[model samples]
Target chain A: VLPTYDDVASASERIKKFANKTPVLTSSTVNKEFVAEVFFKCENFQKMGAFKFRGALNALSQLNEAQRKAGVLTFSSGNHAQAIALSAKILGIPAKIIMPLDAPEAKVAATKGYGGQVIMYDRYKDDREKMAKEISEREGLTIIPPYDHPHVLAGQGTAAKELFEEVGPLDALFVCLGGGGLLSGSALAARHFAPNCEVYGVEPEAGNDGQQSFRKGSIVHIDTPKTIADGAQTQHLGNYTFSIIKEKVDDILTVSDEELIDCLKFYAARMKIVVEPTGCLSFAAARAMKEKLKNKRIGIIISGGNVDIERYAHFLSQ
Target chain B: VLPTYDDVASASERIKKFANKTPVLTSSTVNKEFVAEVFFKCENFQKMGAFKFRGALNALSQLNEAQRKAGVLTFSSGNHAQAIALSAKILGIPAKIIMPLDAPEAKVAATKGYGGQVIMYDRYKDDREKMAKEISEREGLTIIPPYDHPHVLAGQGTAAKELFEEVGPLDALFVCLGGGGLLSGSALAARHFAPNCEVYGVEPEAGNDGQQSFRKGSIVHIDTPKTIADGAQTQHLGNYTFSIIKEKVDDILTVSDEELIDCLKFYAARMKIVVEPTGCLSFAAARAMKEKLKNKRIGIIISGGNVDIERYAHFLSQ
Candidate 1:
């Protein structure tokens, strides 16, 4: 079943004790340049450096005694991996994280630091799901697919819930899209809190499957994109995520890698925040549509800030 | 005459309409690592990307009509240049800014971008004050020295005032020491809001004149030292700043340039904020004394975040 706004409200209550009510930051430069009042829900400051912790914690905490004893498993190479690892640690449940051999060393180390058992795979030659299923069956571990489960998406919705509660109703809201959990969850929160507010999902230009899926009335699949947005490199949206997104999200927009880099520089130089490439997608799209958004109140959800320092420095230099 | 808590209170009331009450941010990682509650007064997010705006705005706003009509003059090669420029523009006063030829291009560009009339000088050969005096005499402009004036230091105190207001009384406060304006001002605020709070001033190891002066019970002067903390490269503290710092400031601590660089990386990687070398001074000192500060509520004032992105990138990479 699709998670509703009621589920979002319940998840907010459950996570409030554990999750941080991240700050709603505003930039004067962004407001004057775009000619709009912009509120940034900065999840980059979230525990484990991403909003993934919200969903991961929500999903892990609700496990019954049998499920908790059996432990949990997930496959991710980015923020979600660290999110689940940290969440499991806090819940005193074991986590088995599958990652590609080429995953950033920082992400691997962070997951391990949180006490997650790391299982490495050759991303180029191995099927991640096959490996995950083998481990889950052998260990009786319950597999939690990132962004697909209703509990996970409901937990992600809390970001938007907090934003609307902080800044009141915005004229429009911008959210980054990958597998659609964050976007779909945000749309639900927007619908309940600000019914008239238009909700837009932004995806990297190299991977516009979300946009195609929205406009074509069906989920679209594509090869893993070659872009700096590692967090949003999903090949396709999940069934649960797509269902909510197709019904709730007003539109999907795409931004170029160059634009993401520009936003990356702008955030570091002007806003003094380190937003990963995937996190820049929402603000990049918002800037591109400034004409239409003039005089309107805007909300931009910064998805995460988990990037290698060396790679982040290289992008900023460029 | 030295400014008091009352002047800071007045400045707070005056600049409330113009100056930003910058956020007080906290880090779970920092708290766990040091076993302390840390409140970071993030003036890096202040207007013009520095807390210098508070003093500049406070000083400029109180100018008489004759002084305002004659315009304002100041000499700075860093954040103060941009702060005065932007503040004067907002108050509709013409600004004559004298900057060093070797100053960061971004700082120079930002000064001009704020409607300041830039006058370049060879920092290595020319005396900055002589040029400012000449320009002031010839143009009949009121020279607003960066950190020497009572109003300026009073304005700087507002940062600590805001932090204390937001987070309540802290056990101790750490502020970066340059020419002593911010530190002296912060000490006054701490005195008023948290009388028992120990106020410590942090300076670059290469420029420890403030520390020396505090210990010797007399102002100490030194030749300019080579350091990454350009913001704290002042030759000596001013009379007014020294008086306040000597009486109000509890101690002065110094951190190596290498520690500043490490802090810059930590802020970007762990906290997702861009803290310049000078801005890292306070936190660096606090971390150095974490053993003594265990389980205590600590306040660290981040001075500014106006470093050139390219230069900042280089530091992160290092």
Candidate 2:
């Protein structure tokens, strides 16, 4: 089912006890640079270090007794694995997370830290979905798709809903486009809560599957596009997420790898936040749209801050 | 005049609108590692990018029309320069800041950004106070001594008051000491607001004037000590601050340059902030006191986050 704003509102209630009402931060320097009032919805400070927790918590909260007993299985690279693992831990549900072996070590450790059963897969050689599906069938485990499920979209939407509620009606919203759940949910949230707010989905230029799909009026499959933003490397958008995004989101934008790294540096030194490369997608787009967005109130969702110190230092230097 | 809690409360009222009501940030990893509940009072996010803004705004707010028109003057290398300039600009007064010729270029730019006139003086030869006093006499400009004035101390204390009010009570409060204004103000706030909290003043071991004074039962003057914590390179505490600190502050601690750098890295990558070396004093001390503070509620004042990107990257690399 395509998630509605009401679904998001309900999801908000369900995860209210567990999820943090993360702050909508403002920067005077950023405002001056853009000549606009921009509110940053810092999901970097979110539980499990990303907005994925919202989806994970909402999906896990919907489990039937038998499903809860059997537990849940899912496949993700990093943020989603940790998200599912943490939320599952909080809900007293066992989680079997299939992650690529080459995933960032910190993310893998965080996932394990939250009591996830790790099943590592080779991203190039083996299909993570296939392995997860086969295991789920034999184990009788309920499968939770990271960004495809209605509950996931609904849960992710709360970030924007909370932002609009806190900052009042924004003129526009910028969200990082991964599997389209965050963008889809946020678009609906903007449409419902802000009324006049136009929502834009941002992706890495190398990983423009979401943007191409939005333009073509269908999901466009692509090769795993190499980019600094690990989260936006999804081959295509989910059918449910794509449909809602097409209908509700105003436009799709892409940022260069250079822009992504630059914005990452900007966030750390100037904004004093440790936003992952994936989190910089929306911010990079916002800066690119500064002239267009001048003298207006805009909102940007900083997707997550899941990167480790060594990688962080390396990323900034590069 | 020694600032009382009542003075701080009054200053709090005066600066309510101008100064940022900064948040109390917490780190799960820190709490888990230290085995204690630690609340970080983020004055780094305050207006003018430091807690000094509170004192500046509070002091300027009390200025008579004649004094406002006459304007104000102060000397500092970093945060205080920005604080006075920004607050003075907001209050419609001209600010003449006597900064060391060797002050960070970013700080000088930020001071100018806030419409403050920068008067450069050689740190090795020129006395900032002497120059400021001569100019203050010549132009009839009021001297807004950074940490010494009653209004400034009271204003700085509001940070602690806000923290204690929000987090209920802290077993220990850690504040960085330069001229002891922050510590004195915070000590008074802790004493009155938290009831039973012990307040600790942290200084760079190289700049150990505050610690030495605390130990010696009198203000012990020293030559400007070379340290990475440029904000704490003070020769001696002012009489007003020394008197208040001697009475109210529980203890004074010192951190090495190595510890400061380590904590700075941790804040940037783990806690997601750009705290200057001076701001890391409390955190370094907290780490030192972790063994004693098990299962206790602790409060740390993350003083300011005004470091530039190039220096920030360099600091993290080191």
Candidate 3:
């Protein structure tokens, strides 16, 4: 069985002090424009500026004293790497992060700045999972997988838990789907708290593995998708996340890169905050589904706000 | 007499339910970079996207039944106009806003969209203030000056009052100086609440009138500044705002438009929020004064977040 409400509750208690209880933001104009009374759970303002911190900290906390001293290893080139680095720093655990060579320079700097050992791999040639597994066996480093881990899924659910606890039952909830950690976790929280609300997972159109899996009622794989929403470009979902999403989520939706970029621009101009392209998936879907969402109370989990300045400016410029 | 701490306290009571008690925000990285524990009072998140709404609403509430029915008039090309328009709409009064032809198209659109009649004038040729006065008399509309009034000053001070109340006392405070409404109001609040804290007013370098006025111990005038900080391009200080600033403020500082642009970029890129160039004045000065500000606890009043998307992009791109 996947992680349940009890697991999320435990993770919430463990990470309470380290993570920010980020605000539920609402914009009058945005509500009017979207034709829904929307509550935005801003994980963009989370510790390390993303919801990935929740999972990272929860996973790191499972380490024994020996494992703490031995260190932990993870493979990611984005928010998850920074998340683990921060969590490790807080818990006084050594962290070794294997990142793709072409990761955002700022994310790389932030991860290293948080005291994580940097291990670089070329995306096209190197098998990151194999490298991480080898390192874990060779160096006695405990492997902390980014999203598939039960603890990570449970930890990510706390976002939706907190949102529901604060705002009560929402009519519907929209969560951005990456490797399905956030969406799967959020689906469980919504089921327990806002029991009647429909939960939808939004993924990039270029990387519609989540949508395909939901429709086909099983796992699906695709070639590497070329899109600016780099975070959700996963070729396939993790086994654990896929199972949870399949059982819990009401539906899966796909948004084009153009739509994601459009939402990113709206977030900057209307909501006065930065949201990564991957983060824009949920809101872009919400806006696209405005007809169905009309006059409804909706919850949108803004996953993160970690875009490099130049890229953000370039996106906005275009 | 200008508005006092007593008047500010009263205004706080009147506007409590209407205005947002914006959060006092800080970034760990920003604190490390500035070498100060800087608390940002984000009036950018204020209603209508600026602190101007506080004063506008407060001023309009004082209108008598006849005056309310006859309506209100104000001359401003930016946030103030929108504030008054929105406030007037709420109070069921007609508003005629006199704006320069060259004002940001976005601001003009927002003002009109808020239910105010947009009266356009040639900025270089026709005088906005004179036209407003003439129209006010002809239409029997009560003139609510953008700043300088006791009520407006008192209303603007509540932002600082709220900031200090939430964040406690600070060693120093930085305020952006436009017509000195915000700076003067902030100074009053800082003096009464954070009695030991020094208050500094920051203005655009092209418009050194505020700085000159502070140093000379009297009001000073200049041609409309050529800087992009449109909100702070006032030719001279208002009589009411000047008196309060002179009595309470510790010093006045100037930042070049280039520095304002730099801060605007930081606000967007690093801070993950949009701050107008004029709004960047205080923070730009604070960053420039990093050496002097080291180890200090600081309060930064972010005056507004109203910037045209394209204009902001243009500055960040530069």
Candidate 4:
């Protein structure tokens, strides 16, 4: 079931009052460097500091009376937790978040701040799937997977819908791929509105599970991804999201951790915006493909901005 | 004379098509900690990476035919130089920028990038004003002061005007006082929209001339300021700006270097925004006055984000 622009529009209406109308930024700095017209859909400015809010809110809003009463539970390293926590709070539903004990302090703090009942588990020792399932059964909670669900896809689709409206049309749109909710949703929306536009999915080179899986026509699993794009370090692509990507997305590209770091610095110094490594991956791919993208109208979805302040010095040291 | 909101509205109309409508930002993190609603008017996101562009463009647009043909010249450390240079280039007028040799390389590069000719002078031994005057006379160019002119004041007012329109009525507005152009202009706009809204002018404690002079009901000068707020390190306030501020502004406050540094960290870490020391002054004042401003809506003008990347580590290290 590939979502279309209409699907995105419907999703937007469903979550209109809930989502933050994130800013669309166009910079002379980027234009001059890339020699192309570039529009950045800054999801870093989104509520809960990422685009996950759109998906989370959309998913929560679609819950039936029985499910809403059951509440919601999810497993995430960070962003998804905060998003689900906030969305659940807004919808007057209880949220239980399962996070790795070593998740970034800022992310942990944000989840707790939004009134999430957080349960920490050791990533190396405990299987998050098993733990989440146990919690769902024991607490009678409806489990919301981060990206594979239809409601989640509809929520993520709203990003492309808003971007198309704000920047008109683009020759290409770049989106970062993790569990594939954002890429699948955004690609469907982009294709629906601008059929001629190419939709590219970007992944960290250190975590090329999606790209490798797509190339091999099978699911690829990695024990761990050694990339600073913590938000996109999933072990395997979601089954439903990958199927959508296989059908609709034009291509998936990989960017090095170094390139992501450099892009973060570039945006901070030139565009004067702070972007987390995961958020900068798509822009990094754009920069890497600048020769091909020049003179083309490009739209890049900046995925998140929930950077750990303690780690900024470490990034700057690099 | 103290200009009114009408003056700012007129200037906004004149510069509407030319200037960037920078975004207004609200951070839930800051809002939660401050226990008050806060709105940040991000002039740092404006043209030339500062709000100075508003005044520079407004002043340039108001130039007579003779002045336009003869070109324009200005002495500035950074933001004002790039503002005038870019404004002149956009207006198809030639511009010459006189900058101290100690000016950051990035700023000088940006000025040159805007097609302005740079004339560097020795800050230790030579007078920037005298140097600019000599070049202006020699080249038959109009000398545009960074502040003090009616056109400049009116130009700076556009920021607050747009801010009021975006955030609705604010209970109080805080602006950093450099040469007083931004403070005076914003005060005019605030008074016009919300006459009862308290207007505060913040100055670095190391350079407390603005508050001290206001207390004495006269203009005064400081020999030197050791604060990191380079943009607000002016020795004396502009006479014209001081006169207008005296009539329209309610109070002038002083903030310590430590407070400004903490404010910078707060904006960078919590707000996920890059703000220089000068731009952080208003925020520092807001933090200092948190007790008084409790339960009130506050607007803070972030003057600029044209920070030198090299100096970021230095500040962060402290």
Model 3 per-residue lDDT tens digits across residues B202-277: 9888789988988898899996676778788888889999999888989999998778888888888888998987
Error of 3 at A42 (Å): 0.8
lDDT of 4 by residue, B54-91 (tens): 99999899888988999999787757888999999999
Return the interface RMSD of the candidates, in order shown, one decimal each. Answer: 21.6, 23.2, 22.2, 22.6
RMSD of 3: 20.9
**Chain B TM-score, all predictions listed:** 0.97, 0.96, 0.96, 0.96
- Residues B150-208 of candidate 2 have per-residue lDDT tens digits of 88888999999999889978899999999977988898889987778878999888778
Tens digit of lDDT per residue, candidate 1, span B166-215?
Answer: 99998999999999889888988999988999999998887899889988
Residue-wise lDDT of candidate 4 within A114-180, one digit each (tens)? 9899877543234577878888998889877789887898789899889988878789999999989
Once superposed on the true structure, which residue ranges of model 2 sit more than 4 Å away at CA? A101-103, A122-124, B1-318
Model 1: lDDT of residue A273: 94
DockQ of all candidate complexes: 0.01, 0.01, 0.01, 0.01
Model 1 per-residue lDDT tens digits across residues A248-316: 888899998789989999999998999888899999999999989889899999999987775687678
lDDT of every model, 2 decimals: 0.88, 0.86, 0.85, 0.84
Classify candidate 2 by CAPRI docking class. Answer: incorrect
Each model's Cα RMSD: 21.6, 21.4, 20.9, 21.3
lDDT-better candidate, 1 vs 4: 1
Worst 10-residue lDDT window, candidate 3 chain B: B120-129
